Motif scaffolding. Sequence first.
Motif: not given
Lengths: 251, 250, 249, 251
Positions: A186-196, A218-221
């Motif tokens: 369960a990520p919180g904030v990871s790679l943010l949306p491309v559009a943001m 990588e951290q999620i992985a």
Amino acid sequence: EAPAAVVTGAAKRIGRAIAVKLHQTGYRVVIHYHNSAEAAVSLADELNKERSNTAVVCQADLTNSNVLPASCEEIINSCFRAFGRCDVLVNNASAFYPTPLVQGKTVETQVAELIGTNAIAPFLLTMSFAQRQKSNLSIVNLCDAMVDQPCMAFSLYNMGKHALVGLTQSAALELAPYGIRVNGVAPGVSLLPVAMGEEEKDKWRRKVPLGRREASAEQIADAVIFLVSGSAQYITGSIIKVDGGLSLVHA
Amino acid sequence: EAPAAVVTGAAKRIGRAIAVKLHQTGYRVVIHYHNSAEAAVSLADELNKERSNTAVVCQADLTNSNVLPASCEEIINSCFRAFGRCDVLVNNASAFYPTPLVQGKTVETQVAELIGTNAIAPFLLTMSFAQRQSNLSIVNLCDAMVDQPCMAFSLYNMGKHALVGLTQSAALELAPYGIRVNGVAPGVSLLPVAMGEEEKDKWRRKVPLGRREASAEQIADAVIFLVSGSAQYITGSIIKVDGGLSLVHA
Amino acid sequence: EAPAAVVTGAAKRIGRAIAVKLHQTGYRVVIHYHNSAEAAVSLADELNKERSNTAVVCQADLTNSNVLPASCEEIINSCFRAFGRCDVLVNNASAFYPTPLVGKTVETQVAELIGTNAIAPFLLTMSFAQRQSNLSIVNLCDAMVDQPCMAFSLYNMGKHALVGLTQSAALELAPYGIRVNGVAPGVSLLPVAMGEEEKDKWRRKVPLGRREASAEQIADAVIFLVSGSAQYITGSIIKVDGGLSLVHA
Amino acid sequence: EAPAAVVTGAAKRIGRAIAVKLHQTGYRVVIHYHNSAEAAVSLADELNKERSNTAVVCQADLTNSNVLPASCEEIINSCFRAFGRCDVLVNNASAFYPTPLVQGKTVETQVAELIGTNAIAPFLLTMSFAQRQKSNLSIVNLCDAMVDQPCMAFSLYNMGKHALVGLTQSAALELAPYGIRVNGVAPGVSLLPVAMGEEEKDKWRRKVPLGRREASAEQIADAVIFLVSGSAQYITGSIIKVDGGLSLVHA
Ligand SMILES: NC(=O)C1=CN([C@@H]2O[C@H](COP(=O)(O)OP(=O)(O)OC[C@H]3O[C@@H](n4cnc5c(N)ncnc54)[C@H](OP(=O)(O)O)[C@@H]3O)[C@@H](O)[C@H]2O)C=CC1
Ligand SMILES: NC(=O)C1=CN([C@@H]2O[C@H](COP(=O)(O)OP(=O)(O)OC[C@H]3O[C@@H](n4cnc5c(N)ncnc54)[C@H](OP(=O)(O)O)[C@@H]3O)[C@@H](O)[C@H]2O)C=CC1
Ligand SMILES: NC(=O)C1=CN([C@@H]2O[C@H](COP(=O)(O)OP(=O)(O)OC[C@H]3O[C@@H](n4cnc5c(N)ncnc54)[C@H](OP(=O)(O)O)[C@@H]3O)[C@@H](O)[C@H]2O)C=CC1
Ligand SMILES: NC(=O)C1=CN([C@@H]2O[C@H](COP(=O)(O)OP(=O)(O)OC[C@H]3O[C@@H](n4cnc5c(N)ncnc54)[C@H](OP(=O)(O)O)[C@@H]3O)[C@@H](O)[C@H]2O)C=CC1
Ligand SMILES: N=C(N)Nc1nc2cc(Cl)c(Cl)cc2[nH]1
Ligand SMILES: N=C(N)Nc1nc2cc(Cl)c(Cl)cc2[nH]1
Ligand SMILES: N=C(N)Nc1nc2cc(Cl)c(Cl)cc2[nH]1
Ligand SMILES: N=C(N)Nc1nc2cc(Cl)c(Cl)cc2[nH]1
């Protein structure tokens, strides 16, 4: 000899990091994609360059429809077709966008995309995976640490992620007598949306107590790899939050 | 230069398996103990035989009392005296017995032992650990079955819930120092030494994954993961290690 | 023949509202207090003025200590002495103040924060049960315990412990028909020593109406849980928080 | 000036008790039903004999499909057509049956029925309800207290109920600015499946700490009544378990 993993939406971002890490750990990988054909093929190229015949791609739309069961069956089939086995399933693919309750996409489309990718497709993939196993077999579902403090106007997305928690638990109980473990990250904030915009990205990053930074792919992985490893042989029905303390911060 | 860890209640069972696994990973270890002096010293000795002067023991009653703050300060002290640093705290020590609501320890002893060991001592240890402060973390041994408790174990359950609270509160507060705080929640692991063979068999047979209790090394595995570089973003999390037991309905 | 309730810390704020609402419903009430003797007596006066012989006060420190068991036993005894029965216990009294990890000694913080929020509820529960119709216990929890304020670790430890007591006691006392439940406020009556600008910060955070709960609103939920309308509910904690706990950072 | 409520699946069992109790409290009611036409009209008749012009029926399939949004908008419309207003929505209707992960409905039908009734239809009803309000407005979702300790082989059902928890929270957040409260009521064991034998019924009854018996439909309705009342003016995003301590009992 080498086990084989399927990773959904593996062409970019978190799913790519997972496919890479599984590959580095000795897995052969099915790189599932929907629109990102060029990225998927490019990844499969790098992996094959490292080890011969260790990566294939597989194209599928995971939107809910009456043919979704057949598409999911086909993802699992493509792993058996390439590698003769399927040891790990990672349900990573996800649609993510707001669906306001009060007013291009019709609502029927919103339902199908957000509920299908996030929940129903993981369910049908799980059935297909298990049917083939009817060894260190496991499923990892990409959940969401923030589902109990949700973003405004994301009801369908949140419904889908809560459903995936339900699947994680129900499938863990039901598949345990087969030795198949089922768990979540369960990520919180990871790679943010491309559009943001960079400014909004910055706002999100700075809410995180541990280092005011988003989780790296990588951290999620790393958490995914832990769950599929022999170091987690007793863990099933668990969801590991990987969120730098984000979900602990009050309004 | 090697990191150092304190493990409470480390003489036997899960705590010993954690201490051993941290030691095997390259950590120097403080083996805290209360009554199990032979086992504690013997463990440290075996570790020191593996690598000279990499293990010390420290005895302390973690019963709640007006001296508990000093005792907990002394445990952390022992790690700095031996090893000049303290990277990891594992709050593993735990009292576990029934405290019925409706009626020979007095209830004030039950309070002091079950709340002290399971919650207050972890709290005071956490204070002392943080006070003294680049991969620092705390791992609290929780309990996956806290929401479906055994009958008559109210004080025990109160303790373990308080420990969840601590994990979250301390994760938040210590994050600006880079100190991660997480937990590991066993379901059934090594069963109580007191528990009859029949009762032990009743528990293991309820476990969906394998109809078997977790090995001490299986619990230690999750602790290892949480202290490792592989969990650098993880804080405030509790990893259930229960074989699916908490998923099983009445 | 009128049932009786003990409410701890009932002299002021939420406990006062709970004592008053139970009284208006037809209970005789033990008003527990620690320091607030004048306020407790005024309340008993107001309540007995409405119905003779229906409210008494009872003083007790609910700090953890080796005599806390006896003081708790004495609070329940006081209900039996006045009213000859004890039908409902509301665990409301609570210490709340920061205890950073990094002139009260830490051992005093432990005793006050853990004793009032957890140990005293446990001992009151034991005494209530030992004496034993629509019997029930309601524990005042906290809706924000999973997203805690910075530096409140002992307080949060106490409130988590009370959730555990709620579930454990619900399970163990069910065979006696005693129900055990909780009410979890978010922002309610703001702390007396808080400045208005800080109060306003906490108000703007609440989705439902941008304001704190009144004490009466909290009391409403208590009333429900003790009523014949909640006869199958035990081990439940009702959040009364206006959606505060749903709001992300 | 009598407020009006929609209750889905209100012809029988718990939904019937809810309709009856709201009516008794002074609400006008729309009795939604799918197959149970005779029971629905029969209840409308009783309610009207008690107060004229206070109860109507509305038939709709709550299966997921591209037509579901229209059907849902129509249910809410029913309440405006009859009563001029719509104050309360109770999402009670629910499909409930096993969906084994490993092997005469098709998998597609099982998805549509279990996710539709339990989650999608509540979401779509909630949009339609909210759109109309763009007073004491609230929604109550009938959840399930056992969703974290689920029955073997009920994956889709549990996904549906977990999604419904997600809806409850997301919608409480999003609709709070309109003064609409969104809450849930989570039965444990209540009225047992009609198709369950008396021996299995007793097995479930025995598991319940509080009195060794199932909840009556009236007991469930009692909780809904509280949530809709002015005694719950500050409650939103909450789920009240009504389960007699069942969810507290370990394996
Ligand atoms: N990133 C974050 O901050 C967070 C992530 N998560 C979860 O982590 C996981 C990975 O996140 P992230 O990498 O950001 O995900 P993305 O938003 O980048 O989605 C990953 C992939 O999902 C695939 N996908 C989307 N819609 C469909 C569809 N209809 N059918 C098939 N595939 C589809 C896409 O494949 P393609 O590009 O080939 O079309 C896409 O590249 C997700 O499950 C997410 O919800 C949870 C919390 C936070
Ligand atoms: N075993 C299991 O199945 C489960 C374990 N857990 C948790 O995992 C952790 C380890 O479990 P397990 O190995 O079985 O634990 P034990 O019951 O073996 O307890 C560990 C140690 O705690 C110490 N301890 C007890 N009372 C005191 C005291 N007053 N002061 C100081 N130390 C004290 C003892 O030290 P000494 O022997 O030297 O006196 C003991 O060896 C605990 O936190 C436990 O609750 C959770 C769920 C199930
Ligand atoms: N107010 C809010 O916003 C919130 C409240 N809550 C919970 O709701 C309940 C009521 O809150 P609120 O009314 O603000 O409470 P208060 O902080 O006003 O405390 C209530 C009473 O507790 C008593 N008390 C304190 N310490 C002791 C002690 N050592 N021994 C005995 N009694 C003691 C005091 O009695 P005396 O004055 O007689 O000394 C005090 O009047 C509490 O359980 C609280 O944690 C939860 C979340 C938010
Ligand atoms: N009974 C219990 O013990 C428990 C109940 N609950 C929850 O409480 C609620 C009420 O329970 P209960 O009364 O037993 O429910 P039922 O199983 O009796 O179903 C309620 C109604 O749902 C309607 N429904 C089913 N499928 C559809 C569909 N495809 N489209 C439209 N309506 C449909 C039916 O209407 P019709 O008959 O007109 O066709 C049915 O009468 C449910 O949400 C349930 O999950 C939770 C835990 C346990
Ligand atoms: N991109 C996705 N598929 N999922 C996703 N992306 C997310 C981004 C944020 Cl900032 C949060 Cl709170 C949750 C998210 N979930
Ligand atoms: N031994 C301890 N200190 N803790 C402990 N021991 C435990 C044994 C069980 Cl069978 C469960 Cl359900 C929880 C337990 N917690
Ligand atoms: N006064 C108390 N005893 N408890 C209490 N008071 C509180 C006030 C706030 Cl603003 C929050 Cl969020 C929690 C609280 N808990
Ligand atoms: N009948 C429904 N639609 N839902 C329902 N019916 C249920 C019956 C039980 Cl014995 C449990 Cl534990 C959960 C249930 N959920």
